[PDB]
Amino acid sequence: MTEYKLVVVGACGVGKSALTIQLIQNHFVDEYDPTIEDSYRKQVVIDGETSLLDILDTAGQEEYSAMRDQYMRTGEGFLLVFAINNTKSFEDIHHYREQIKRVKDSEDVPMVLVGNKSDLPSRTVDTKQAQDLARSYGIPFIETSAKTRQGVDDAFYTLVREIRKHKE
Numbered sequence: 001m002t003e004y005k006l007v008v009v010g011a012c013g014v015g016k017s018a019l020t021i022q023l024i025q026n027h028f029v030d031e032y033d034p035t036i037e038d039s040y041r042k043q044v045v046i047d048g049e050t051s052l053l054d055i056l057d058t059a060g061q062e063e064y065s066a067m068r069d070q071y072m073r074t075g076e077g078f079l080l081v082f083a084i085n086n087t088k089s090f091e092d093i094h095h096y097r098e099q100i101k102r103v104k105d106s107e108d109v110p111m112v113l114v115g116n117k118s119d120l121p122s123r124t125v126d127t128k129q130a131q132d133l134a135r136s137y138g139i140p141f142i143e144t145s146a147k148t149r150q151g152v153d154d155a156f157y158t159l160v161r162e163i164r165k166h167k168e
């Protein structure tokens with residue numbers, strides 16, 4: 001039925017590929033090529049409605065390109081991923097949201113804030129601080145672990161729900 005282009009963004013090392021490969025292939029990768037950018041496709045039923053998801057896992061370099069902008073424009077929703085043990089990656093969220101706003105030429109873009117690595121005890125970003133950030137953005141916040149699979153489906157499916165809400 002409906003096709004959704006989902007884009008997974010966030011700093012290096014936060015778990016973007018690990019989340020995406022869990023969702024698609026149902027295993028946890030311990031180290032995956034940090035530069036590679038690929039898309040993945042999956043059909044899922046969400047709220048009784050079949051959804052064909054096309055998921056772009058971002059990586060590459062810390063640089064502007066017209067080519068990356070082109071692909072980011074195709075996205076209909078974005079996962080803003082940080083790691084709960086990496087404060088810099090949380091500080092970086094703001095940058096990704098701003099660059100999304102730029103390429104979509106919209107401040108109302110479907111997004112979900114994802115705090116990954118929830119299985120690690122050594123947390124440095126409090127749930128409250130991330131919840132307050134998500135509240136300021138008007139988006140959901142979901143804690144995940146690509147390692148245990150806690151919240152992985154929920155994060156992607158909540159982003160599809162956000163895209164559906166926005167399209168109406």
Ligand SMILES: *CCC(=O)N1CCN(c2ncnc3cc(-c4ccccc4F)c(Cl)cc23)CC1
Binds near residue numbers: 009059
């Ligand atoms: C370790 C490799 C990795 O995961 N990344 C490389 C650095 N990336 C990155 N660095 C800075 N800026 C961005 C900006 C974007 C972006 C551009 C336009 C719209 C939306 C958007 F997120 C991206 Cl895709 C990656 C950047 C990515 C992480």
Ligand SMILES: Nc1nc2c(ncn2[C@@H]2O[C@H](COP(=O)(O)OP(=O)(O)O)[C@@H](O)[C@H]2O)c(=O)[nH]1
Binds near residue numbers: 119146
């Ligand atoms: N403990 C833990 N490690 C994770 C989790 N997600 C990713 N990692 C690890 O963190 C590192 C970076 O993951 P990766 O998916 O390559 O990050 P990316 O640069 O954002 O794509 C790898 O060692 C992964 O195994 C998680 O939820 N829990």
Ligand SMILES: [Ca+2]
Binds near residue numbers: 032035
């Ligand atoms: Ca990656």
Ligand SMILES: [Ca+2]
Binds near residue numbers: 137138139
């Ligand atoms: Ca909103």
